Amino acid sequence: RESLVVNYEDLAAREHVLAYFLPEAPAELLQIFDEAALEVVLAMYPKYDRITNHIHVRISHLPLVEELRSLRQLHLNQLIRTSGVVTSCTGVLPQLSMVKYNCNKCNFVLGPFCQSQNQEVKPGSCPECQSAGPFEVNMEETIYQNYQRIRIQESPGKVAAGRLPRSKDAILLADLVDSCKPGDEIELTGIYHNNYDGSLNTANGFPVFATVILANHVAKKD
Amino acid sequence: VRGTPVRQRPDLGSAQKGLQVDLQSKLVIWGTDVNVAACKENFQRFLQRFIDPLAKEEENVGIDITEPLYMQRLGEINVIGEPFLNVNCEHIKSFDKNLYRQLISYPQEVIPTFDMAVNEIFFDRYPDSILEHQIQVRPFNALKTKNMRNLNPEDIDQLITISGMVIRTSQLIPEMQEAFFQCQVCAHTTRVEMDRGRIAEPSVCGRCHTTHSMALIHNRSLFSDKQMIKLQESPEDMPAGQTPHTVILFAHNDLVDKVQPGDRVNVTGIYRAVPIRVNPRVSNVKSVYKTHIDVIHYRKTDAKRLH
Amino acid sequence: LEVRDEVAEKCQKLFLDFLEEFQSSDGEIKYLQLAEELIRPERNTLVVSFVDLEQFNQQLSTTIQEEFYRVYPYLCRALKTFVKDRKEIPLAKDFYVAFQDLPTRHKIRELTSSRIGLLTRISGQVVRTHPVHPELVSGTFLCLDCQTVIRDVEQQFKYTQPNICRNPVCANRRRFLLDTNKSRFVDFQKV
Ligand SMILES: [Zn+2]
Ligand SMILES: [Zn+2]
Numbered sequence: 001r002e003s004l005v006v007n008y009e010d011l012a013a014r015e016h017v018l019a020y021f022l023p024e025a026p027a028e029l030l031q032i033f034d035e036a037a038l039e040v041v042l043a044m045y046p047k048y049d050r051i052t053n054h055i056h057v058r059i060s061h062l063p064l065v066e067e068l069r070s071l072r073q074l075h076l077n078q079l080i081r082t083s084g085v086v087t088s089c090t091g092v093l094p095q096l097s098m099v100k101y102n103c104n105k106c107n108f109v110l111g112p113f114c115q116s117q118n119q120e121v122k123p124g125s126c127p128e129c130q131s132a133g134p135f136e137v138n139m140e141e142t143i144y145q146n147y148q149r150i151r152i153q154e155s156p157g158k159v160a161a162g163r164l165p166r167s168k169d170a171i172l173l174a175d176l177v178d179s180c181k182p183g184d185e186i187e188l189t190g191i192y193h194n195n196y197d198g199s200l201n202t203a204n205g206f207p208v209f210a211t212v213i214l215a216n217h218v219a220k221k222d
Numbered sequence: 223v224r225g226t227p228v229r230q231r232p233d234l235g236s237a238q239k240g241l242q243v244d245l246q247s248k249l250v251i252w253g254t255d256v257n258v259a260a261c262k263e264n265f266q267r268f269l270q271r272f273i274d275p276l277a278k279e280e281e282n283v284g285i286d287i288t289e290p291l292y293m294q295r296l297g298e299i300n301v302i303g304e305p306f307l308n309v310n311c312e313h314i315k316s317f318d319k320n321l322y323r324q325l326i327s328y329p330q331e332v333i334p335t336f337d338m339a340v341n342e343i344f345f346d347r348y349p350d351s352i353l354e355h356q357i358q359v360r361p362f363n364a365l366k367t368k369n370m371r372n373l374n375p376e377d378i379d380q381l382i383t384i385s386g387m388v389i390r391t392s393q394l395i396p397e398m399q400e401a402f403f404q405c406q407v408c409a410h411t412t413r414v415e416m417d418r419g420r421i422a423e424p425s426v427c428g429r430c431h432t433t434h435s436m437a438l439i440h441n442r443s444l445f446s447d448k449q450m451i452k453l454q455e456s457p458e459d460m461p462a463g464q465t466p467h468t469v470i471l472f473a474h475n476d477l478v479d480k481v482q483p484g485d486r487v488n489v490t491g492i493y494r495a496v497p498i499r500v501n502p503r504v505s506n507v508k509s510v511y512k513t514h515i516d517v518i519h520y521r522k523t524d525a526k527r528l529h
Numbered sequence: 530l531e532v533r534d535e536v537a538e539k540c541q542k543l544f545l546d547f548l549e550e551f552q553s554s555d556g557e558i559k560y561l562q563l564a565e566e567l568i569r570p571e572r573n574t575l576v577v578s579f580v581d582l583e584q585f586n587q588q589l590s591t592t593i594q595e596e597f598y599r600v601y602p603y604l605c606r607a608l609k610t611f612v613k614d615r616k617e618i619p620l621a622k623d624f625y626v627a628f629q630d631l632p633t634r635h636k637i638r639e640l641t642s643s644r645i646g647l648l649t650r651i652s653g654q655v656v657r658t659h660p661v662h663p664e665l666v667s668g669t670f671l672c673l674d675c676q677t678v679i680r681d682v683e684q685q686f687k688y689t690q691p692n693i694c695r696n697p698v699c700a701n702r703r704r705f706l707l708d709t710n711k712s713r714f715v716d717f718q719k720v
């Protein structure tokens with residue numbers, strides 16, 4: 001399954017320092033937890049390295065539940081828990097994870113670079129010919145992680161008075177994909193992302209940032 | 223073989239592919255007719271069954287005439303400890319003309335087979351001897367080339383013997399033989415031996431898998447010795463109008479500093495033609511090649527001079 | 530995991546023991562008394578007798594003689610620790626180990642390639658002596674493609690730039706900028 005579900009209540013009860021740090025710097029804490037969980041899983045099943053070589057630690061039962069209308073710049077780069085209704089959901093898309101590049105000047109293969117979720121990974125020079133010239137993605141040598149984009153809007157029941165339902169975009173990565181369908185009522189825990197490529201720098205208007213949520217744990221309500 | 227290291231022989235030049243071709247649709251080397259197996263067997267036969275009939279005790283000192291000459295030479299080698307066996311190309315010619323011709327025309331291939339044969343014999347016998355390296359066979363006394371400027375290009379890369387006077391000898395040139403690379407990240411070390419005159423650098427660490435982190439440490443490598451001998455040829459066939467000839471020789475790892483200026487020698491070595499770069503800083507080479515001799519054997523003995 | 534040169538580290542430990550235990554006829558620590566003088570500036574070499582080394586530990590002396598080049602930096606670090614744990618020499622100061630009284634002497638004609646990298650002693654007549662220039666022993670370069678600092682790259686008797694930028698996604702192998710104020714130098718003369 002590649003995913004280990006940690007209860008935030010249990011984590012807080014046992015080690016409160018980790019619980020307090022998790023909602024403040026979730027990216028580093030999640031990476032550390034993934035590494036530690038991979039170490040423990042390999043210790044238990046040393047043969048399991050050939051299946052996944054990576055363990056995703058899904059947090060659960062976060063105390064504070066924020067509704068989409070209450071997400072502000074304060075909650076940027078933090079682990080948040082919200083509830084909503086999946087309105088649209090793209091197919092499963094192969095996103096680059098460890099990308100190898102072909103240098104189409106000498107055919108060398110620039111080795112794997114971790115494709116982060118913020119910026120495109122643009123190699124520098126080819127180590128052999130030192131040519132910064134054009135590169136291509138070697139799709140045979142590359143390894144991809146499943147990618148899905150969903151939209152979740154405030155549930156009509158929760159929407160009150162004459163206010164419109166606010167919607168947000170969420171990103172599912174290689175284990176949360178196909179965990180929801182359009183119309184499903186879900187609870188989503190993830191990082192309130194801000195900085196990938198969206199700042200409206202095209203002078204089209206004011207310098208606002210299109211925010212997305214990197215889903216860390218999805219719990220359907222049924 | 224007794225596990226003793228097989229020393230590389232720069233005097234034979236950079237190795238080749240050693241490609242083998244079957245002459246039927248027997249198993250010669252590409253471009254030659256040496257048949258390493260047959261050559262090695264024939265050389266073992268020569269080494270174990272050669273008796274010089276018209277030899278003289280004065281000519282051969284410390285050698286039992288009736289007993290096989292080169293077997294006695296191997297005994298001397300075992301006694302002393304110098305793994306060099308000097309073999310007479312005239313003896314080879316007398317024993318088997320075809321073997322002599324093959325040695326002359328294909329030295330870089332035939333000689334290592336002779337090394338293998340000699341080591342096999344010498345370790346089948348004297349099985350407990352200790353030597354810093356395997357035996358190296360040095361042929362000499364090839365059919366004398368009267369004038370070195372009668373050599374045509376069809377005589378390139380083959381064994382010849384010339385007589386000359388040593389005019390100059392250069393300092394020692396350290397020739398690399400085994401590059402020692404070390405990673406600058408994890409300090410993992412590897413060694414790459416000369417393939418064909420080129421050292422294929424690691425380009426990626428075998429320990430941390432970092433690319434182009436392996437730096438070549440120069441003073442932790444294995445080096446050879448080379449010397450340049452400027453020798454004024456002393457031909458005995460001098461045609462009308464021809465002037466004195468100066469030739470370049472290269473000595474490798476044991477013949478270095480074995481001849482001083484003023485010494486008259488008979489040098490046996492490989493006639494090598496090499497390209498010349500138009501500039502020191504470019505890889506273009508003139509279509510005309512300059513020749514030089516890679517020395518295999520010095521001979522300081524002459525019948526018409528003192529000692 | 531920064532592969533260890535076990536032979537060299539063993540040599541370093543043995544040489545430090547030799548420094549801190551070896552004694553003269555009087556019975557005191559002669560090399561402690563000598564290293565007492567290394568604290569002063571413009572004084573960064575300790576002279577050690579190969580005879581004393583051989584007496585104290587024949588195996589250590591033979592190892593040093595037969596692998597002098599590879600082990601020499603470790604001997605220098607051993608001397609640095611020996612001086613530091615006694616006195617308050619500047620942290621950045623380097624120390625060198627000179628050897629003398631080597632029993633055997635070779636000839637410049639006998640200085641073949643087989644003698645490369647291993648301790649030797651020769652006799653010569655000085656023809657001319659060049660001036661005293663600072664020499665680069667280890668420089669810290671800056672990458673001109675990503676401003677990554679590649680630190681402590683050794684110089685092998687030649688101006689050597691980093692073979693590759695540390696940044697995995699940057700294959701800069703040409704455009705480096707030496708940082709003189711961060712590099713270390715040693716006195717140098719060619720005679
Ligand atoms: Zn390239
Ligand atoms: Zn490495």
Ligand SMILES: [Zn+2]
Nearest residue numbers: 672675694699
């Ligand atoms: Zn760089």
